[PDB]
Write a protein that binds this ligand. Structure first.
Ligand code: MG
Ligand code: MG
Lengths: 251, 50, 50, 1340, 277
DNA sequence: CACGTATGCTATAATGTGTGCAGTCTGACGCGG
DNA sequence: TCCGCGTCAGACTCGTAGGATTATAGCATACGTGA
RNA sequence: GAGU
């Protein structure tokens, strides 16, 4: 693919495929030309070296290197290990309708609540706001709905307020060691850019506000909303699954 | 160490007591950064088998 | 042991996704193994219902 | 005291007299690079060394050769300023004189054939700034010094490698600076082996055979002799008494006529001294004792001439008989012991498959080049080219030096190539260590860890460049004609320039300078790294190296290192520490002679230090006599105990020298746990400079040193009176005594104004002098961004109360008063840089026009005719900055766009829409715009207006230079003319243009007029060529990247005020996030009515054990108490006398105050200016370990009429009732860290998606989705939440059908799940089939 | 045992005998005349020359083994076109073919995007010019400085230096941390995301719904022209194929459908609102 | 035909690689002699 | 059956910055598509 | 480099 600056960028497989094709076609040539056998042999060794490099580079001997010194990433490498397909892109994913920010105390909150920044929530619930805007007839079309939310019009905040009521959001803290590392709350919109966390669940998250950050996820489907409210809600998940003990305790 | 720290934090440590404190402290901190990975690998193996 | 027990599951998608992936897929490819997808790992990978 | 100190004196509670002042803090960087460019004549250094090393080089034919004469650095085309604005490297051209000499092949060495000498350009080398940085591509970058294993020799041993045997195997390693590694090692069977570059293992004796050592000679080298005389019939043996030690006597030991030991009897000390004193030389022995002794030399039968026994062969009764009967009656055995003198080499010769020298060279050759057929030529060549060739092997001076001292030699300096002596000596010492005499070294010892500053590394890359060019040169010299070929036609600059740019650019050690703070800069430049090339890896690093080493004392900080995976490896240098000439770390120490402590100082290296006993600095001196107490606390051999006074050899110079610069700035560090202190010194570096530079009330004293030495403050080169103050510049007129007789003697410092930092913070210099003020040399003329009157000001002190409050300070959470926000004191300035690129594309050039399809006139209002936003214009997300678009081709317009454009009429234009607009949610004021145009593209009308600005501004700048310089210069001639013919007002009447014609008598003063006349004309022409240069650079169509026609850079400024989610901290490693900004009415307030600024949670103290923060608070309050009392006396206007009395009594409070400060010397006016500054609060210094004691702080509180407890009665702002008990209240100096919530908050519903995996991108800069990782997945699995999980795998991520369908369902209210298959799995399959494994889906 | 492909090949060539002038001529006479043995002996004997030359053309594009095969192909052409009757030696002649064949192959394979020999050779003369200029101008040479020296167009020089921009690998990580590379930031531009896809669905469904509210004849003359409801996007004159069969009446009714629809967008709340879009 | 792209030919004699780095990581578990 | 060499693993999210280099002669006749 |  072409970069903006007129440059190109390509996969290592293309360099490896080029190696294999050049040596293979040269072998076709040497066979049409009836070449002496020592030369035939060297080309067959070269072909095996290039195929081996293409399938699994650093396996048989020295991996074939780029100008950077670094060995070219082969097919096997794209399945293999942490950077491979399984671990990186398939058992764990980048996810839509996800945010993160600093957390801070919300001592006024009840156990089922969390302070959710207005700007953050406006963007996370974008399609829900557009759909409600068309039902009120405030927005003629989606482009008009988009421009209304960009302008952050006064009526849009009242709609946003309408949508987030009774809608659970997931808060997550790294690292996620046990299931309580994710809990659902009912969000409370706040002006200001930090998430407000309930004190008593600080224990489950191992969250202390020395600058900790947390991640926000919106359950979209009716199924997901009910999964969040019934299974994952903080009010519903008090006891440690490890020992029969209440994990929610004043500190 | 054969010679302990006779002083306390309100009293204030001297250069040698503080230098001696350092070793233990930094061993602790280095353990946090480095060992969390062996423990986590064990979590991973366990999860995978169950 | 945990590691070998996870690799002993009939599901080769689960086995390969854990570790040792080069060896797992050669063993499965030569046996002509068919994974009927009962496990959680396997369903998460194909993006289906747990 | 100095003039700037007369304005504000810091009260010092230190008690130890300072024998050594803090050195220049940026020593390392500047000395090192100075040595790299320093052209040394003999003792090659840096470039000079690089040329002498590679050159002179000759052709492969040997007839033609290139020799080096001399080099020069051209002066830099663009200065630091222009380089920073343009985005180019600040460098000098390298011009090298080189002489092509040619030999005749007919004459022997016909050197007088062709000699062609000329000066060739090869590359520009980056220059170091005044403050130890490089400007690369317009960005300040620092190359951090490195810490690596010193070349030389090293003896090591895995303590129980095989855990089964658990036997200690000793090894040696010879580490060169350049060449192959040479390893010697033991095996379990005690056989000595040799390996080169950890290759396949070889018997150690094989290498000796390569050096031409016969078996006989090898045994003669490592073993002693045991002599056997065969006399008459009985066997006799030559004795050394102290051989038969710790042994059992196997036979009856008797000599002349006295029986000493019986069979099976232990030979102790007593028997040995008895035998020695009796003078026993020969003893009769049994014939059967020889069975098992190893013969040393060969013996042949003189009669037959055949071998009776070869060397190293175990003797028997029959061999001995045959030896006697041939006529050998003096058998030489090898004295080999199993407890002391181990027979290692003896057993290794039996393992050695090789016989002679050639057999050994072949076997070595066969190791490193296995399979390839050996030749003798090849074997000899390879072995000589390993460790015996000038070219491929060099220990360096350091290597030979460390090598010789490790082998207990006398000679320091010598050959970089290994001699036969060297190898054998190393084997010998390894064997001594196996025997039990000698010890193995350790790598963590700073005697084995060397520091490599920039200049040596630049030198190394520069050598590589020269070596690569040398290949090209030899190859072109071979095929070249001798006559036509110029020397510069063979040299290429690209390879050298490429090696050096690759160092200052690709290298791990060359990184973006950390400059969000003066302290951050100065600490970053004094950083040491064990990483990068020739170093350890984060992955490769154990725990031993990381941990604090006894040798670190006074050299490296124990308390300064990142709490990352880089925890052991990155380290700040200690305060007084310095680089040894050879590169080892050294620390100053005060020499103690006869118990009397001299003021002579000695820097001791790591190795030297171990040998003496050093007293601690805390020892009480008897006023220049000796130690008061008869026991003194000292340390030697890296361990600490009591000693007598006369035993003490040295003493610590300063209390401070154990700690680094960063840590030295923590007051009451003595009362803080090392963990918290680490975090404290690390976070102090992240303190963002506020709008108002506020001095810290509770300091240490290092503040002044850091601020001045960092270079961010303008300091006076020469003392005198200030002629002209301005916001933009400062002119000082120099005093007659310092003022040179040549020039006018007026220094002009132009101050650097609101400019961008690397962290997007704001760098501004403010003038801190008044117009017409007398100034001392080396005083602060202007303050840098985080400095107040020459002291370091990283944040702001304020009124703090430690008490819980309604959970708004729960876990470190901080409750701050709106008052602080209102006073705008924590407010910060941020400068961002946006650029707009007009490129040349396939379709055509992009235009920077204001004429853009589909733009409101509201938007076009802020753009000028050219399409560039006006200076001063406020902008917010989506507003257009620079009107730039990219050309577009043909595009199937959808039927709806056909219809829509038919309604409106406005058809699409050629260029599309790619104008640079304000990033979403960032909002600021345009403070400046820069335009780069290439050479020959038609300029914007705006670019022309900007050139008019720069030209006329340049003209004004240079005009004011020549005007102030001419006024100052004639003002001197006027004074010279008065010395001789004084006619003051009479000379000034007729014009000043007709002045230099007037002379004086033929004296030194007539020659002074001539000097001033020559320089006046010098400046006259200099002004012309300077202005021509300025005008050329302003006209200069900047050379940009290929494809790019012009680039417009907008600089936005933003004023950010503190708010919840911002990160704040003290200097004791106490972090916190602001939770709430409280109204002033609600803040806890005292009986006097004054409200607190901050309420911190006391529950963050006892666990943390950072009690520094509490002492800082108590003393801070006391300081502010004195401040409030002076403030009260100034409001009343009592008088000079009374203020003077109180202030003297205050400065001279402490039990043993070091600093005495008499106010009787201060004039009345000087007193008033001091009190004026001290009213905000009296600045106090607590040196690190030599700080203020509780008694002193309580005494200071009593002078303030504040309580001994430092706890006060506080009242709830809301209720008005008092809190139940006294609360600790005072002033803690607090910092706003770079972690602003504005930079951290991020949110996304739907956006761009990744290229192959189709899942969303990462990161807020790419508008990224949060990673829901394996650990996060498992949580949903535990919960049983199946749809939430599926959702995150499919419609949220890859499933392309699913995401759009789901979006449409969400806008239609119906939250229906419509999933499919993630696109990454489809890819997986394709990747596995590309491997040639059939993976198919069997359907239902 | 040696399993290095290189060392094994070099061993093989080592043990074939070096030729004298008269041997070369005798073999080569029969070789041109077609002697299977003769060509083989000349080739196998002169392999060592190939390796000596391929060693001088190293560290550039391909590896040593790669160079050696193309070099061999050059030596083959030399043996095919050698003139024994000319007094000139074989080694001199072969040198040309091996250097030639190696250089030409290093120009087509060295670059991921294949540059034709013409572009490459042009570029090379610009480059060697630049080297001479840099050696007297201390500072590197500008595009115009090179163009000034050749008396040639600045665009010619700049276009050629543009082609010299070398590829970056997608998989090469950024920031010393082997974490995220170009692939991990480089977004799919061709395939746009669901906000834009769903906007187009809403736009297309809006106009389809507007035809239902417009005149039946106006909706059967406007939609089928643009290809909104029809199958093929016709023009003013082409709407005569359907039922219209008119030129004036089609043009009036197309625009009459547009005028009533423009007032439908002014009233719903777009018109100049959706003008910026 | 032309514009771009390719294939071709050179005649003193030349005839066995290296080359630039790697820095040593570690505890475990199989797999040929 | 035991030494030795090989291969395989080694927490989770967040940030920052963009990217480097070399060099391939010179000229004469073909090969392919649009006009 | 930020919280573990
Ligand atoms: Mg905490
Ligand atoms: Mg925390």
């Amino acid at each position: 693919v072409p970069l903006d600056g007129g440059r190109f960028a390509t996969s290592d497989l293309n360099d490896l495929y080029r190696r294999v094709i050049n040596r293979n076609n040269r072998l076709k040539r040497l066979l049409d030309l009836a070449a002496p056998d020592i030369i035939v042999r060297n080309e067959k060794r070269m072909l095996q070296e290039a195929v081996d490099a293409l399938l699994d580079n650093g396996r048989r001997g020295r991996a074939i290197t780029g100008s950077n010194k670094r060995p070219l990433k082969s097919l096997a490498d794209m399945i293999k290990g942490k950077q491979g397909r399984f671990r990186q892109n398939l058992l764990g994913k980048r996810v839509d309708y996800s945010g993160r920010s600093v957390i801070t105390v919300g001592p006024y909150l009840r156990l089922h609540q969390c302070g959710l920044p207005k700007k953050m929530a406006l963007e996370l619930f974008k399609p829900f706001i557009y759909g409600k805007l068309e039902l009120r007839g405030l927005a003629t079309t989606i482009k008009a709905a988009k421009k209304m939310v960009e302008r952050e019009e006064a009526v849009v905040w009242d709609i946003l307020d309408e949508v987030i009521r009774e809608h659970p959001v997931l808060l997550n803290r790294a690292p996620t060691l046990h299931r309580l590392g994710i809990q659902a709350f009912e969000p409370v919109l706040i002006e200001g850019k930090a998430i407000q966390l309930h004190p008593l669940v600080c224990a489950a998250y191992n969250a202390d506000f020395d600058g900790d950050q947390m991640a926000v996820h919106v359950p979209l489907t009716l199924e997901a909303q009910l999964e969040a409210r019934a299974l994952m809600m903080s009010t519903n998940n008090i006891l440690s699954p490890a020992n029969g003990e209440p994990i929610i305790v004043p500190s | 160490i054969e010679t302990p720290i006779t002083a306390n934090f309100r009293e204030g440590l001297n250069v040698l007591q503080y230098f001696i404190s350092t070793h233990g402290a930094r061993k602790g901190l280095a353990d946090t950064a480095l060992k969390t990975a062996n423990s986590g690998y064990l979590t991973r193996r366990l999860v995978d088998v169950a | 042991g945990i590691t070998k027990a996870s690799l002993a599951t009939e599901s080769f998608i689960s086995a390969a996704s854990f570790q040792e992936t080069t060896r797992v897929l050669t063993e499965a490819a030569v046996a002509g193994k068919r994974d009927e997808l009962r496990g959680l790992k396997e369903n998460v990978i194909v993006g289906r219902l747990i | 005291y100095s003039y700037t100190e007369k304005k504000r004196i810091r009260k010092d509670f230190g008690k130890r007299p300072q024998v050594l002042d803090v050195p220049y803090l940026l020593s390392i960087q500047l000395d090192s690079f100075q040595k790299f460019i320093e052209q040394d004549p003999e003792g090659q250094y840096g470039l000079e060394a690089a040329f002498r090393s590679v050159f002179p080089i000759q052709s492969y034919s040997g007839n033609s050769e290139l020799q080096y004469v001399s080099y020069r650095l051209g002066e830099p085309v663009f200065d630091v300023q222009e380089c920073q604005i343009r985005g180019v490297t600040y460098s000098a051209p390298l011009r090298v004189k080189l002489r092509l000499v040619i030999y005749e092949r007919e004459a022997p060495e016909g050197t007088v054939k062709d000699i062609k000498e000329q000066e060739v350009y090869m590359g520009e080398i980056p220059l170091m700034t005044d403050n130890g940085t490089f400007v690369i591509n317009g960005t300040e970058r620092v190359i951090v010094s490195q810490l690596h294993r010193s070349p030389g020799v090293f003896f090591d041993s895995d303590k129980g490698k095989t855990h089964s045997s658990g036997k200690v195997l000793y090894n040696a390693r010879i580490i060169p600076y350049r060449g192959s590694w040479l390893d010697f090692e033991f095996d379990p069977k005690d056989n000595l082996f040799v390996r080169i570059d950890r290759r396949r293992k070889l018997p150690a004796t094989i290498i000796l055979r390569a050096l031409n050592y016969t078996t006989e000679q090898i045994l003669d080298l490592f073993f002693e002799k045991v002599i056997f005389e065969i006399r008459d019939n009985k066997l006799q043996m030559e004795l050394v008494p102290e051989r038969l030690r710790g042994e059992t006597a196997s036979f009856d030991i008797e000599a002349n006529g006295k029986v000493y030991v019986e069979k099976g009897r232990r030979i102790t000390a007593r028997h040995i001294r008895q035998l020695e004193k009796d003078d026993v030389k020969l003893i009769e022995v049994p014939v059967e004792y020889i069975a098992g002794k190893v013969v040393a030399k060969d013996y042949i039968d003189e009669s037959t001439g055949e071998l009776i026994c070869a060397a190293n062969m175990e003797l028997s009764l029959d061999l001995l008989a045959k030896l006697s009967q041939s006529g050998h009656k003096r058998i030489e055995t090898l004295f080999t012991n199993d407890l002391d003198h181990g027979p290692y080499i003896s057993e290794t010769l039996r393992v050695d498959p090789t016989n002679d020298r050639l057999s050994a060279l072949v076997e070595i050759y066969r190791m490193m080049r296995p399979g390839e057929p050996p030749t003798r030529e090849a074997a000899e060549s390879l072995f000589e080219n390993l460790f015996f060739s000038e070219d491929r092997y060099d220990l360096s001076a350091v290597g030979r030096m460390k090598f010789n001292r490790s082998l207990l030699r006398e000679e320091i300096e010598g050959s970089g190539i290994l001699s036969k002596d060297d190898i054998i000596d190393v084997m010998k010492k390894l064997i001594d260590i196996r025997n039990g005499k000698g010890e193995v070294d350790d790598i963590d010892h700073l005697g084995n860890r060397r520091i490599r500053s920039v200049g040596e590394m630049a030198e190394n890359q520069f050598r590589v460049g020269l070596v690569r060019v040398e290949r090209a040169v030899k190859e072109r010299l071979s095929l070249g004609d001798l006559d036509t070929l110029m020397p510069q036609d063979m040299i290429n600059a690209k390879p050298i320039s490429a090696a050096v740019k690759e160092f200052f650019g690709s290298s791990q050690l060359s990184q973006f300078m950390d400059q969000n703070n003066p302290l951050s800069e100065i600490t970053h430049k004094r950083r040491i790294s064990a990483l990068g090339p020739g170093g350890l890896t984060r992955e490769r690093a154990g725990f031993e190296v990381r941990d604090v080493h006894p040798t670190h004392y006074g050299r490296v900080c124990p308390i300064e290192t990142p709490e990352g995976p880089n925890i052991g490896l990155i380290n700040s240098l200690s305060v007084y520490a310095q680089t040894n000439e050879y590169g080892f770390l050294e620390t100053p120490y005060r020499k103690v002679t006869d118990g009397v402590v001299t003021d002579e100082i000695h820097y001791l290296s790591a190795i030297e230090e171990g040998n003496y006993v050093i007293a601690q600095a805390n020892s009480n001196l008897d006023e220049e006599g000796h130690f008061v107490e008869d026991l003194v606390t000292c340390r030697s051999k890296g361990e600490s105990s009591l000693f007598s006074r006369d035993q003490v050899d040295y003493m610590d110079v300063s209390t401070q020298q154990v700690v680094s610069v960063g840590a030295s700035l923590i007051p009451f560090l003595e009362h803080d746990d090392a963990n918290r202190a680490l975090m404290g010194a690390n976070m102090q570096r992240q303190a963002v400079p506020t709008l108002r530079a506020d001095k810290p009330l509770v300091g240490t004293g290092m503040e002044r040193a850091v601020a001045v030495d960092s270079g961010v403050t303008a300091v006076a080169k020469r003392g005198g009176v200030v002629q002209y103050v301005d916001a933009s510049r400062i002119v000082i007129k120099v005093n007659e005594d310092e003022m040179y007789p040549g020039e006018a003697g007026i220094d002009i410092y132009n101050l650097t104004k609101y400019t961008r930092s690397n962290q997007n913070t704001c760098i501004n210099q403010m003038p801190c002098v008044s117009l017409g003020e007398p100034v001392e040399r080396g005083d602060v003329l202007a303050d840098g961004p985080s400095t107040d009157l020459g002291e370091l000001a990283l944040g702001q002190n304020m009124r703090v109360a430690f008490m819980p409050w309604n959970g708004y300070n729960f876990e470190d959470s901080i409750l701050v008063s709106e008052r602080v926000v209102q006073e705008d004191r924590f407010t910060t300035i941020h400068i961002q840089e946006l650029a707009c690129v007009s490129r040349d594309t396939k379709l055509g050039p992009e235009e920077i026009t204001a004429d853009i399809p589909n733009v409101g006139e509201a938007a076009l209002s802020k753009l000028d005719e050219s399409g560039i936003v006006y200076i001063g214009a406020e902008v917010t997300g989506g507003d257009i900055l620079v009107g730039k678009v990219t050309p577009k081709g043909e595009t199937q317009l959808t039927p709806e766009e056909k219809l829509l454009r038919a309604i409106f009429g406005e058809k699409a234009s050629d260029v599309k829409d790619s104008s640079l607009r304000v990033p979403n949610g960032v909002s600021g004021t345009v403070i400046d715009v820069q335009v780069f145009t290439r050479d020959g593209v038609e300029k914007d009308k705006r670019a022309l207006e900007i050139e008019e600005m720069q030209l006329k501004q340049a003209k004004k700048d240079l005009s004011e230079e020549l005007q102030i310089l001419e006024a100052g210069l004639f003002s001197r001639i006027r004074a010279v003319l008065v010395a001789g013919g004084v006619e003051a007002e009479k000379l000034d009447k007729l014009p000043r243009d007709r002045w230099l014609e007037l002379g004086l008598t033929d004296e030194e003063k007539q020659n002074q007029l001539e000097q001033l006349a020559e320089q006046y004309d010098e400046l006259k022409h200099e002004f012309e060529k300077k202005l021509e240069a300025k005008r050329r650079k302003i006209t200069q169509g900047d050379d940009l990247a290929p494809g790019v026609l012009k680039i417009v850079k907008v600089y936005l400024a933003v004023k950010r005020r503190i708010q919840p989610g911002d990160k704040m901290a003290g200097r004791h490693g106490n972090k916190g996030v602001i939770s709430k900004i409280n109204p002033i009415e609600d803040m806890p307030y005292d009986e006097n009515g004054t409200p607190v600024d901050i309420v911190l949670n006391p529950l963050g103290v006892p666990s943390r054990m950072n009690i520094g923060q509490i002492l800082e608070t108590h003393l801070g309050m006391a300081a502010k108490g004195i401040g409030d009392k002076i403030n009260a006396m100034l409001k009343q206007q009592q008088e000079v006398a009374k203020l003077r009395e109180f202030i003297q009594r205050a400065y001279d409070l402490g039990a043993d105050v070091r600093q005495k400060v008499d106010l009787s010397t201060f004039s009345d006016e000087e007193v008033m200016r001091l009190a004026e500054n001290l009213r905000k609060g009296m600045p106090i210094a607590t040196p690190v370990f030599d700080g203020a004691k509780e008694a002193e702080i309580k005494e200071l509180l009593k002078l303030g009429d504040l309580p001994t407890s430092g706890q006060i009665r506080l009242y709830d702002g809301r209720t008005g009732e008092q809190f139940e008990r006294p609360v600790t209240v005072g002033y803690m100096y607090m910092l706003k860290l770079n972690h602003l919530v504005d930079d951290k908050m991020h949110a996304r519903s739907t956006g761009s998606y990744s290229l192959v995996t189709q899942q969303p991108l990462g990161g807020k800069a790419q508008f990224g989705g949060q990673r829901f990782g394996e650990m996060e997945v498992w949580a949903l699995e535990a919960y049983g939440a199946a749809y939430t999980l599926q959702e995150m795998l499919t419609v949220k991520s890859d499933d392309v059908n699913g995401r759009t369908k789901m979006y449409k369902n969400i806008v239609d209210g119906n939250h229906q799940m419509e999933p499919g298959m993630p696109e990454s799995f489809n890819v997986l399959l394709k990747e596995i089939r590309s491997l040639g494994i059939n993976i198919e889906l069997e359907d239902e | 045992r040696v399993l290095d492909a290189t060392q094994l090949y070099l061993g093989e060539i080592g043990y074939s005998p070096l030729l004298t002038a008269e041997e070369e001529v005798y073999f080569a006479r029969r070789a041109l005349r077609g002697d299977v043995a003769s060509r083989r002996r000349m080739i196998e004997s002169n392999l060592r020359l190939v390796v000596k030359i391929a060693r001088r053309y190293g560290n550039r594009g391909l590896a040593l083994l790669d160079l050696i095969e193309e070099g061999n192909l050059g030596l083959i052409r030399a043996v095919e076109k050698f003139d024994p009757e000319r007094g000139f030696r074989f080694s001199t002649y072969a040198t040309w073919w091996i250097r030639q064949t190696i250089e030409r192959a290093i120009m087509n394979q060295t670059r991921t995007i294949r540059l034709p020999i013409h572009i490459v050779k042009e570029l090379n003369v610009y480059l060697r010019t630049a080297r001479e200029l840099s050696h007297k101008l201390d500072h590197e040479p500008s595009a115009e400085e090179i163009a000034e020296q050749l008396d040639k167009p600045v665009d010619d020089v700049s276009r050629m230096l543009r082609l010299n921009e070398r590829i970056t690998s997608v998989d090469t990580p950024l920031g010393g941390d082997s974490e995220k590379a170009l692939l991990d930031i480089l977004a799919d531009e061709k395939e746009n995301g669901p906000e834009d896809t769903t906007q187009d669905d809403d736009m297309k469904q809006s106009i389809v719904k507007w035809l239902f509210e417009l005149n039946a004849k106006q909706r059967e003359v406007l939609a089928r022209r643009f290809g909104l409801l029809g199958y093929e996007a016709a023009t003013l004159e082409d709407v005569g194929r359907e039922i219209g069969l008119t030129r004036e009446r089609v043009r009036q009714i197309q625009v009459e459908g547009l005028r009533r629809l423009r007032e439908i967008l002014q009233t719903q709340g777009l018109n100049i609102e959706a003008l910026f879009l």
